[PDB]
Amino acid sequence: DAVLELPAATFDLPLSLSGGTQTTLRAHAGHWLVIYFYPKDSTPGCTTEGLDFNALLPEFDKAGAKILGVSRDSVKSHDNFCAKQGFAFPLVSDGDEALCRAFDVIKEKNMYGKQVLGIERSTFLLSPEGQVVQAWRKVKVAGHADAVLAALKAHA
Ligand code: NA
Ligand code: NA
Hints:
Blueprint: E1 15-16, E2 22-23, E3 33-37, H1 44-55, H2 57-62, E4 66-71, H3 75-85, E5 91-93, H4 98-102, E6 106-111, E7 114-119, E8 122-126, E9 132-137, H5 144-155
Parallel strand pairs: 3-4, 4-5
Antiparallel strand pairs: 1-2, 3-8, 6-7, 8-9
This protein binds sodium ion (2 copies).
Residues 28-29, 31, 33, 126, 128, 130 line the site of one sodium ion.
PDB class: oxidoreductase
Keywords: PrxQ, BCP, redox, oxidoreductase
Assembly: monomeric
């Protein structure tokens, strides 16, 4: 029932959050976790995605689930982004791309005559026992948070 196996060490990686604290995936044991990776703070698309998740947060709560957004922007950038948009969930500053690589969301594109890496917008649903049970890759923003919520309700 796992669609992705993560390195065991992934669950103990210290994840720097907006607000200056740290978490790990293991610390979320016991409830559902949505982890949504996005390429960059404060862009039109990535802002829309975060606001879409933020608007549905009471429905996610009803399943006791929690949301984490992830990019490689700094904690300061995340703090600004969260404050300006009013997000009520944390953002991981995955500055070294450790979590991104664990979930295999760093993808290469041959453009400008060279190989360019970047975060591919992707989302994962992690069970209360830490299994990755559903994955969405190369995500288009429109309708995405709704679809993730629907899938959560179906799994939970
Ligand atoms: Na960190
Ligand atoms: Na979990």
